[PDB]
Symmetry: D2
Subunit: 325 residues, 4 copies
């Protein structure tokens, strides 16, 4: 009859009370076990019988690469059984830009992996966690929802981890993607799909971390009007593997940045040019240094280069990774 | 008799030749002087009396603050003359997020000041520089554009320096303000205003740069998963007078981020928290260090802090501007 | 000390209950009365001294000019009082395009008049009503909200009754103004104002229905590829005094439409040309019949023609109200 | 060994002319021919072997279904050959909502079929036609464009026909798909794809007009506050085969509208309910009459209904096409 699904908790807002009926102020978030959540929404049972686990309880601001490593692995572990049809994961709102994209490059299965969260506290007037969680499961248990990549579900929308991001600081509808749109929507208890991702992911993925201990170090440097050359000397003097330049316009550099990058490359450090605008593609130009991010954002570019460096260190191949993913 | 407008040049995309026709990726900017641009469109003389003089002729991504001053002083002295009705400045698009906001805070006259740029080489198949210029001048020569704050014209749109920025990396409809919209639009050789900036500016700005000669130093640090903290130590060790932070949401800070921000504040450095999303408001929170930017972007916030520091240091008074400007 | 405001209810998708709590669709609108709505949110009592009046109890789509005319009268002479600082109104979203704009033209006061609603049933898992209603009272209770026009608060945003509209059939963030933005934003128990409408309204309006009891009948015709010309005949043979056209391009006409308009005009009746695209300007064009709606949508345009015809019949004058209002 | 591409001209705004270089509101359309438009863009020779063929010289305002059925076949006939690789179609802009979706249901192949237009006259400053046509032939000639469905190309974008629509009325960047997005983009002489349509089309379609001479008439009725019922009889009394209801809210009908509907559904015709909002889905509702569009606009809903009326007449059958195309 009903399918079996597992909820993996990491903290967040959906599982976090405030101190007032309408308190949307800096409070302590992520203070809820996976046991209670079952309670609050007993309507979940009509959808599918569920089992819960506790993977952690830390703010998304402090989510770390170490955890993503432990998470991806576990995920593959449970997705491999016959009594596990899908997986839902509660997570923070501040870094939901990175976490769901990392598993997109490392889970080896067709069975659904869905992230869910909330902008309003669980005690706020008109809290969204309930209904966002309710629909996050529904898509998990759906047959048609298979083989579409890692998904993100908030505000009645269904979007891919390759495109979505938090576009506004504190609004309910922050997550979106101007250019790419959504995958599908959830209306009237029914689900409607509209489009499919046209990039490589999950199964066809070449990245595997079945047995990796630590990832390389990758920094992000902003580009502005009077940017400091010395900001570069640091990461270098700390031996990081790669650097992601979040630059002006389509990743342009000043005579101070054009200089620092070279200094870095010589030392064997890989650099990638991304934009600071928030949308669009950065094209290539032999008149400038470094490699070029496709239409990946600073945040997601770091997540790519980090895994692209455990495989190889050859520019050509790397560059070709940014256009295929 | 027709109006008196002057067009101060700086050269950018609008005045930069390409190697071929369809080539709109590899080129040189600040290669074509004012004069020629004036020639390319003989229809401009139907709108006003044009006068032009070069000042920079350099790519947008390499402009420093010591040059901005020169510009503000230059435009004020031209606006005080009983025989000048408006100004029109050309600039690149890369750092067109900063420049406009600077004059909008230092120019002391209700007479019109219009910035203008292009997204393709003047040699592209359907170059926009032409129509955008005629369109900028039309606005400046209007008698109703007076007292509206610094203006930026592109793609037939009229926008406010305080809100407008480059959202996309390559498209030509890149400049927009999702939550704020535009002040006016130009359709059919006709102008239509619809809203007015509701913040402090120009004629009523408490800042006056007319007698200084060197602005303070201000850096910008990014916020992401696993972020380092030696970045902060770098700026402290070089004498920065203030730091802008690009939070992960409502400006959240990580464990290491919390740490860095304090070392700086403990040494006389003022730090303002902005946001890496793109649009939105960072709210006050006594559970974190530094000040909060209203809804200004990391880029724009840095410009407002430079000036702030040339008149004070009382953190309390600094917070108030961000809310009013 | 504590301000005091009055609440006027007229049913709507915010007063509807449903068989279950997971029923987004399929509910009876206009089930509860103002009484209940206040009892649900005990926080309101901490913002002001509330009071209500169940003027009607229906659903958005059955609203009628009769009801409108009444509603405007009852608010005028209640804002005239000294014991009333502001008034909030509850309404469906199915026609919130038309109700706010009507009052925006007929209310004679600088005091706050706020419209509010919700997209999902009061019985639903995360009904948006409670918080929407909390904010509506909040903006009415403020004093810096004076002389701004008729406001409409929904989903934490403050939009002007002249630019806002339902842009999506079922989403919970359906009200927005692509080219004009929002006036302010409610965040962290604070309201932030950014812009001001720049067209005539309220106190400076020349339309006063105080001594009127019947408005002219106006229809709306759509423009598509094989549009028939007999629809105009049918409207002409019913008395109507004016038709709003919902043209294809920027008011483009068909052969069947040219013949159409041309026919009714001679029959002494005014026709305005609007567009079906949902935003933008409709330029003059002496080579095409009828007048031109500035940037008013078919519905906003119909509201402006009824009122327009109570004070005149001159084509020329009506053609100026469309550029100023 | 570049491909062979044919250009079927229909005239449109991309072939329009005027007097002064600044004219962009009063001009004749289609005035130019396929011959001269190519003479204007030599760089095309670089991409493929081209031919031109005139089929009409009117504007999008006057496109009747007669022509469409004619065009629909000449394309199929022209694509079944081997000396034909890709074909481009020059159109106006007023009804580019319709035409593309018509062919998307009737062409039986996998070869590219792209539409292209321009919002400015050819005589205009910074005219957008040339760069547009260049990018249009560009995609057709490419081989990774097969099996992706009919494509619309303007202002550097490649969007789908089941989603694209004219958003703004006069802007140069009008064509958008708020919730769906673009399939690909064109930056620096290189194509970038990212999204795939997820619905039945071209080949898999179950529609063929190869043996059709005349199509069934379908009219659209708008939805507003005080709507007339005498509007439904006008059609019923004229032999309409179908009616699309552009309903307020999510297809919401008014008391008067409810009567006119049943009144017709009983006589014999078929009726579908869409939205006047511009986007979103209309859910199923037993409490209301008629069929429900999926998330198709009134414009597109008609074409579909009209083509489905050449096959079956069973209500339940048709409701199933709206969910699938």
């Amino acid at each position: 009859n009903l399918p079996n699904i597992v909820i993996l908790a990491t903290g967040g807002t959906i599982a976090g009370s405030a101190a007032a009926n309408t308190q949307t102020t800096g409070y302590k978030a992520g203070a809820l076990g996976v046991e209670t959540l079952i309670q609050a929404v007993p309507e979940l049972k009509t959808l599918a019988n569920i089992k819960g686990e506790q993977v952690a309880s830390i703010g998304s601001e402090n989510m770390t690469s170490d955890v993503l490593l432990t998470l991806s692995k576990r995920v593959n572990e449970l997705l491999a059984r016959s009594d596990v049809d899908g997986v839902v994961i509660t997570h923070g709102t501040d870094t939901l830009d990175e976490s769901p994209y990392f598993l997109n490059l490392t889970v080896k299965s067709d069975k659904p992996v869905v992230f869910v969260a909330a902008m309003r506290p669980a005690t706020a007037i008109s809290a969204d966690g309930p209904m966002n969680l309710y629909g996050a499961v529904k898509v998990a248990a759906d047959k048609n929802s298979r083989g579409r990549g890692v998904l993100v579900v908030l505000n009645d929308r269904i979007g891919s981890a390759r495109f979505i991001s938090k576009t506004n600081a504190s609004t309910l509808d922050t997550f979106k993607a101007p250019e790419e749109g959504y995958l599908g929507v959830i209306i009237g208890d029914k689900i409607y799909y509209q489009t499919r991702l046209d990039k490589v992911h999950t199964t066809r993925s070449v990245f595997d971390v079945t047995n990796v201990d630590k990832l390389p170090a990758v920094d992000i440097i902003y580009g502005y009007q009077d940017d400091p050359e010395y900001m570069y000397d640091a990461s270098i003097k700390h031996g990081v593997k790669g650097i992601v330049y979040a630059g002006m316009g389509a990743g342009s550099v000043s005579k101070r940045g054009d200089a620092g990058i070279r200094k870095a490359e010589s030392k064997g450090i890989v650099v990638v040019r991304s934009s600071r605008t928030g949308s669009g593609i950065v094209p290539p130009d032999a008149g400038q240094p470094g490699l070029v991010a496709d239409s990946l954002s600073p945040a997601k570019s770091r997540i790519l280069l980090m895994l692209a460096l455990t495989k190889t260190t050859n520019p050509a191949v790397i560059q070709d990774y940014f256009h295929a993913y």
